[PDB]
Design a protein around this ligand. Structure first.
Ligand SMILES: Nc1nc2c(ncn2[C@@H]2O[C@H](COP(=O)(O)OP(=O)(O)OP(=O)(O)O)[C@@H](O)[C@H]2O)c(=O)[nH]1
Length: 316
């Protein structure tokens, strides 16, 4: 059996050729404070912390100990399943020493051999763009920690860019806007809920208002206020600008013929971050190019990592 593993910032997905996305579990680990050892991974850690055994702490490795990686991979590989060949999705900006570290750890986790794929190429394969044709295609993968842009043609990446401004950074910007605007400190969970509920990249008209709670910075005491979609859009302006610039910087680095094909096919957005309302419209208006959101934007990467198992030669 061959496995494709997308160990995301918050969510891990395992794909087994044949069965498809067999596993969906949080990118979470549970570590004994005293033994300083990984006691559980994924749902097992969730259950552990959920049973509250004490002396356990829960951590998300996010963006890296070779041991944490190898242990995590050991759990997801065994739970999903004579040893497997594993395609591991990696961010675009990954160095070669890091990429070798992922392979050794995956090999230590129980893989015959391991191969890596850049998230943008996987996202493109999962979103059914014609990656193998000599036509140019563009994918924008906006996750939690990273936004990654790439142009693909003939089973390779022509040009690509990565930025650390993405879904998490949208939440931060909301938190910072409310800190400055209302002298109120909200947490991550509330910031995420605001982005999901009333967040938008632009045209916040009709999105609505939300009551939120946080810590007043003068008094230290909890406080409830009303936040508008208009304000949240402003709070996300610069974050959205940054994403638009990387798309434009990638086009400026694209050959004309491929740049001309993308103007016809359009740009595909993948990743949970791409669910920010009207981001597709904003990027389209600023690029003068069709922009669409992929059909299954949260599973594209994992599906692409799974389908990449059929051309394992290329990644070998
Ligand atoms: N605006 C908005 N964001 C969402 C929504 N649902 C999920 N997200 C965001 O999706 C992001 C993570 O989604 P994924 O595409 O799975 O990213 P990831 O694979 O876990 O992390 P990466 O490794 O960087 O790709 C988080 O930042 C979430 O806030 C939604 O409905 N609206």
């Amino acid at each position: 059996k061959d496995l494709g593993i997308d160990l995301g910032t918050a969510n891990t997905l395992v794909y087994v050729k044949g069965k498809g996305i067999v596993l969906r579990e949080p990118s979470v680990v549970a570590i004994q404070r005293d033994t300083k050892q990984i006691v559980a991974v994924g749902n097992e850690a969730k259950n552990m912390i959920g049973r509250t055994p004490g002396n356990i702490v829960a951590l998300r490795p996010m963006k890296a100990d070779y041991e944490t990686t190898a242990t995590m991979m050991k759990y997801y590989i065994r739970k999903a399943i004579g040893k497997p060949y594993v395609m591991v999705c990696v961010p675009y900006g990954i160095t070669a020493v890091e990429e070798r570290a992922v392979i050794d750890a995956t090999r230590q986790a129980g893989a015959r051999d391991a191969y890596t794929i850049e998230e943008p190429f996987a996202a493109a394969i999962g979103a059914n763009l014609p990656v193998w044709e000599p036509t140019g295609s563009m994918v924008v993968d906006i996750g939690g920690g990273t936004t990654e842009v790439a142009v693909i043609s003939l089973g390779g990446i022509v040009t690509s860019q990565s930025i650390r401004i993405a879904g998490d950074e949208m939440d931060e910007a909301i938190i910072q806007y409310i800190r400055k605007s209302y002298n109120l400190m909200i947490g991550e969970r509330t910031a995420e809920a605001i982005k999901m509920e009333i967040g938008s990249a632009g045209n916040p008209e009709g999105i609505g208002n939300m009551e939120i709670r946080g810590r007043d910075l003068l008094t230290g005491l909890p406080k409830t206020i009303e936040i508008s979609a208009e304000e949240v859009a402003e709070a996300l302006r610069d974050t959205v600008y940054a994403i638009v610039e990387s798309v434009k910087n990638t086009l400026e680095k694209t050959p004309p013929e491929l740049a001309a094909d993308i103007m016809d096919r359009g740009i595909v957005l993948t990743g949970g971050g791409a669910l920010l309302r009207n981001l597709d419209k904003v990027i389209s208006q600023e690029t003068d190019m069709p922009v669409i959101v992929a059909e299954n934007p949260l599973d594209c990467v994992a599906i692409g990592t799974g389908k990449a198992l059929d051309h394992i030669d290329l990644f070998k």
